Amino acid sequence: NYLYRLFRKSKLKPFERDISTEIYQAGNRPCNGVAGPNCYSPLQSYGFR
Amino acid sequence: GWIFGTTLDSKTQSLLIVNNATNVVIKVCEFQFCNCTFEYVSQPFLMDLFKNLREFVFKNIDGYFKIYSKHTPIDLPQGFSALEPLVDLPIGINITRFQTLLA
Ligand SMILES: *[C@@H]1O[C@H](CO)[C@@H](O)[C@H](O)[C@H]1NC(C)=O
Ligand SMILES: *[C@@H]1O[C@H](CO)[C@@H](O)[C@H](O)[C@H]1NC(C)=O
Measure Cα distances from A20 to A36, B17, B18, B63 in Å.
19, 27, 30, 18
Residues in chain B: 103
Closest-CA residue to A7 (of A38, A46, A40): A40
Would the CB atoms of B10 and A20 count as touching at under 8 Å? yes
Torsion of CA B43, B25, A17, A23, to 10 degrees: -160
B9 to A15: CB separation less than 8 angstroms, yes or no = no
DSSP assignment string, A6-49 = ---SS-PPSS--------EE-SSS--TT---SSEE-SEEE----
Interface contact B62, partner A, CB < 8 A: yes
What resolution in angstroms does the PDB record give? Answer: 3.9
Q: Cα A34 to chain center, whole Å?
A: 13
How far is CA A34 from each of CA A7, A22, A40, rounded to the nearest angstrom?
16, 10, 9
Method: cryo-EM
Smallest Cα–Cα separation from B56: which of B85, B32, B35, B28?
Answer: B85
Distance CA B86, CA B66 (A): 7
C-alpha torsion B90→B91→B94→B100, nearest 10 = -130
Separation CA B15–CA B23 (nearest Å): 10
Q: How far apart are CA A7 and CA B8, in angstroms?
A: 20
